[model samples]
Target: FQSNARKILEEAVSTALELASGKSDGAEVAVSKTTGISVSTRYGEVENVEFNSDGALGITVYHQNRKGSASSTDLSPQAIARTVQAALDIARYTSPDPCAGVADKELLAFDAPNLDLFHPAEVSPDEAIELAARAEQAALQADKRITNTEGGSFNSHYGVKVFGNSHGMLQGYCSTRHSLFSCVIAEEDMERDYAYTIGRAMSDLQTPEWVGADCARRTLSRLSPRKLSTMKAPVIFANEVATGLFGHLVGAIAGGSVYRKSTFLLDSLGKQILPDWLTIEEHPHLLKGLASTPFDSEGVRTERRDIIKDGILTQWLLTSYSARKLGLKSTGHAGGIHNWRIAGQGLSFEQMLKEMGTGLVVTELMGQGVSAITGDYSRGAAGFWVENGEIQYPVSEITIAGNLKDMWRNIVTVGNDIETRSNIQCGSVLLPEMKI
Candidate 1:
């Protein structure tokens, strides 16, 4: 597959910066283009095949502390000129804000390194269909009880991104991502589950057979789920679902929430928010990391840093504008977090279950019953019940309720069965007790 040339996106960013420089005090532009192919199969037949090549350019111009932004899918010269004019027109009419402008020149990512993120594969449509079909076939053959399937899919993406600003910083990179997914349904209860593997390079992805068999196994485990009565009990969040707990922490500590005084962790900087043994750190330059990036959206250089250190809140996720509002320096989180790895105690899943003794092990969560303002949490959950450190049976139709403040404090252990496919990598988490 041919991705949009890097020079083309660079030209687009350059052109937008050129058009906005004379009209504004400062300007920034981003250009991106992605091309990809995908195939999905159900049972043994191809269900969907798609090919896409999409591109967009966004321009932001700052005038006297007022900023305006515009985007265009059309990257022609005329379209670029019109987009810059539209941004300038809006900047001139909008009320000025003292915090508006490009990032500090010294903070711009002028020496962004190549992170080796690109690894494209020239897979044809027929090959993608065959791969998808093989995944579905494997799932169907994995178990006689796997009576149905949602589908199996294979997708590959290649893209180029360029960013430039009037501060004399211009840089771009190319990246490719590939993924395989499979979902199967159990015959007895019609319960379903899915498994997927994703990576920057095709070589890093697990085989279709592995994805299919894992999907079937997960579906089979939930075949006859039981219901649990509402009561307070110890709970273990499987690594796959444990990431959300930390995500809530991130939301509460975000700069926008802190500045607006709408977050539960407001004024929590330098305060203990987690267990003394726990630590959360950011590493943006991890080679082939899913969220690896050299700079943030504002061109601010990213770095390895601690978000939580020995339980205390160390920093807030901040963009340049939000940092200015909070009277702090930018944390290079404008585009979001990078690799926020949560350190675990190296306990295996069995050890975590043993630590729980008797309770619930949550593998899936449903409903949006979380509040950053109050730190209240109540969500539908499904998984297995445990007795004497052993998983008794699958359980469902239960609600897990707790306050984030108490939940964080009650964390007992984080297992070492880490899930690394996401930006927030961590192990299964154990909490002393929660309403379940």
Candidate 2:
């Protein structure tokens, strides 16, 4: 934890709960402090630098079945007490709600385990600027066609989170994140792309030189892009892009969307939602995982579970409030999913490409072309076009269209090139055919 953060957070939570003790049926409080440093460079020169420090406290009070919430950027004892009183005052004026209270005592996290989520790096702003400058310089020198760069950036963040409630749950943890990124544009075609690395520990990140050179390589690849002819053809979503594809399933199964009848996969538990051979597992206690956590936003203890067992939807992502609305139990997903591991065919990208023979390898997707209500999907895409099991040319200015239901069923393979930059640990996926 950051210096003195736990002490301040504990005091804030206790102050808020004590202030609301006799006036409310129950109360919940959360406090957080974060610090970050960011530096950016362009054209081998420092472009911008930023330093951030923030602290906040929020209080929720339940009175006569009504819920009220209030928050403040101040974390002082007096400020927290005022916030708690404000919540109580609001709760008395609100309409009654049967499901508005702190999480059940049994479900609250206790003796939270250390997941090694924090690995703070002592990189100063000057050091960050130097790192970004080196990346841009490397990219500029790597390729003559890398005429200009959007920018290169290095960012590091540290945070402490604490939660307490009337249920006697008081837990806190610390986490850190670091990222290096570079983006460049080709001289002739003005085509642009980026490369980035993220990790809980600075030791895990690729060197700044590698990021710059790789960004140049990716940007140069699009020098002479073509447009694919509209037709039904197989497609492989690169691992990076594939992450967003599966995230749609997460959205569709979210308890809030399901209860509101705003999702296509409503009440889809026990039904097939993906290929028969596929499964999705959630690991909330993964050591050093980017999304690792012992509890959800509501302090509900998180557990490992198969979200998709052999393609069947096993459970909905739920919080205490949403679960009560659905007459179910909380799945410890108030904030969002933890580390999700999707099963793949274990085939390499090369093997998966050969399996498709001739198809499109989508590396980028654009446009807001999705509808959870209808399950219809259409997105502008750009990437390499393949012929005879090899990449022929870069393609752009095309739209891929399909229905989510059909797309999930038509999945042919999932490659082994897993994307580790996100909470969704998935690999490249091949679909038999889609409208191009």
Candidate 3:
């Protein structure tokens, strides 16, 4: 299957490149094929199975400083011929843009790195069903309060991506991702909540029973949640919740936001935006890392770099196009962060909770009430209200309001319980008093 798919992409890309050599200034081709299965189990029975494979070939042609890109599901010789012609024809009619061009030929990954991404392990549909069932069953057995199940799901995906361009660069890579999730409804007469788990590699996942129990525990904690009167107070954002704090920073530094001047971080470069003790870095070559990649979609080589050094803004996420517009150079972030690491004399969750002494520990966030340009933030929240270094009770039906400009500077501490789902691996963070 690997050889056959590779053959199809190579034929399509090679043919397209040959056709564009004399007709256009440049051509680029990319192909990817994914195979995966998703199984959901409820009450020890199969609920749903989504087994599928998808493939596509994309081509772009540059002519007279104007470029046009197109994609097709068909990769047959006839189809490739038609697509190549269509690309050239579209390029001829479209308006020209100086920023629309491929990366430098010298920068191409002629020798793409071997990051050990591919995993030979494959999970069958039966195994997925069994695992999901086990997860749900474990949750059901973990606590009597877990009266029902929203269901459990197991999924695995393996895919290969190929890139070729008129610059004599052709690269191919593959990777595997596995995930197991269980969401059970913990009931306490009119009160219910759910939890889940997911991962990128099979070995990285915890046992189904553990995943389920973790879910059960969280749901159980959420029972009988209460509300709080409006007041100003310190807040502790859990690892998952704190991720959004950094996510906002990432978006603000992105090429799109930077170019549009739509980010509150505008003109923040080289400024002391964060605490002097804190550091944020981007690593692109971490093995088994979720977002690890040798190059960006535009084919520029990637590298590790410090985004925030001792609290100062140092770099903006830039692609070739955005770099040109900003009169700068690409930071190899055409596709966003590879792995964002935060360091600030980190502490454990328990230590952080006690460190804050008394605050709201936000576990769940609701609403999209953040302004990129103004940095204004107001959102519905649910979590536990802490009192004198102890959790007084679960909290709900409250709003937290603050500005990123103040939030980033007032961080009291950062925890070590980081989540691996995204490029931003932020842990928990304690902030100074904010409106609640």
Candidate 4:
């Protein structure tokens, strides 16, 4: 597959470079192909199963300062030629912009490291079904109150990505993802809630039985929830949802947001943001990390960088384009963050909860009611309300509101229970104080 992808990409890039040399300033080419399979089980039977294959080629050309891009699903040489020609034609008619061009040639990933991201499972459709069935059965039997099953599913993804540009740059890699999930519903008093667990690798993932049982337990916890009146108190974000805090922070520090003046953290560089005890670091080389990539989408090398050092803003998340607009070098974040590690002194969830008593342990969050410009955050939230170091009851129909300018400062502690399912590897975060 590598040989094929390389050959196809080499051919396309070669065609693009030759076609654009006389007509354009710089150009880029990429081709990708993916094949995946999914299986879902419900009621101890296979409810749905599917296999898919997809491929595409993209070409972008810059005529001095103007840039144009074109894509095609067809991989034939004729199609590749047309795609490049179309890009050049678009560039011919477009107005020039001073910031438009390929990424800095010197920033290319000449040494693409092997991060061990590809670990495909030899799972057959029957095997997937059996795994899904095992998960569903475990959840269905874990609790008597878990009377309904949403479904259990197994999914596998494998794909190759090839990138090249006119600056004698070409890079390619293949990666895979394996996940097992079980969603179950628990009921009480005419109300229900569902929970599920997902993971990236068969070995890395929890056992299907364990995932199902855990899902059932979480679902059961949501039964017979109560409503709480607004109050000011501390809040402990569960490991499952704590990453959302960093998500908002990422948005605020992104180069696009910074350049557009659409983020609250626009002038926060080198300034303290979170509590001095917290630090968020990026490690793109973490082996098998979900978002680990040696190079970005534009063939630029990616490496470990201090995003927030000791709670201070150290750098902005930048792609080549946004960096150009911001008068800064690209941070190799063309797509998004890699393996982000929120640094913290290890503390157990239970220990932190006991010490930071009488607050909310938010397990679920809903709504996208955050203002990036104003830094206002108000999200519909549901979770367990705690009192005196005890989980009093599940609470619902509540809104957690705060301004991020002040919200991050309230972080009291970061727990040891970090979630690994996403690029944002955050732990349980306890806000020393909050008002909602």
Cα lDDT of all candidates, in order? 0.88, 0.87, 0.82, 0.82
Model 4 segments more than 4 A misplaced: 1-13, 16-18, 190-200
After superposing candidate 1, which stretches have Cα over 4 Å from the reference?
1-4
In candidate 2, position 313 carries an lDDT of 91
Model 2: per-residue lDDT, tens digit, 367-389?
87899888899999999999888
Q: Residue 381, candidate 1: how far off, in angstroms?
A: 0.8
Q: Which ten residues in a row have the lowest lDDT in candidate 2?
A: 38-47
Error of 4 at 144 (Å): 1.9
- Steric clash count of candidate 1: 0
Range of the 10 consecutive residues with the lowest summed lDDT in candidate 3: 189-198
Task: Name the regions of candidate 3 deviating beyond 4 angstroms.
Answer: 74-79, 189-200
Candidate with the larger TM-score of 1 and 4: 1
Clashes of 3: 0
lDDT of 1 by residue, 1-436 (tens): 2444888888889888988878899999998888898888988564799888899998889999898989999989999999999999999789999987899888889979898889987677888787777787788899889888889999999888888899999999988999889887887766988999999998898888888888888889898988988788989999999998888887898898898999989967899988999999899998988999978888899989888899999888998888999998888888889888987797899998887789999999999999999999999999999999999999998888889999997698898999988989999999887677
lDDT of 3 by residue, 1-436 (tens): 6546666667777887898789999888887888788788889454799977887878888998898878887767888788888889999899998987777776677778877776644666677788888888888898888888888878788777888888888887777777788887776744555555555578787889887888788888888888898888899889888877888887888887888988988889899998898888888888877788878877778888888898899988888788888887787787678888886465788888788888899999999888888998889999999987889889899888889889998798898888667678878898898889
Q: C-alpha displacement of 79 in model 4, angstroms?
A: 3.4
Q: lDDT per residue, candidate 4, 244-341, as tens digits?
A: 88788878988998889989899899999888878888899988888889898888899798788878999888998899998988989988888888
Question: What is the full ranking by TM-score, best candidate first?
Answer: 1, 2, 4, 3
Tell me which of candidates 1 and 3 scores higher on TM-score. Answer: 1
Predicted structure with the largest TM-score when compared to the true one = 1
TM-score of each: 0.97, 0.96, 0.94, 0.94
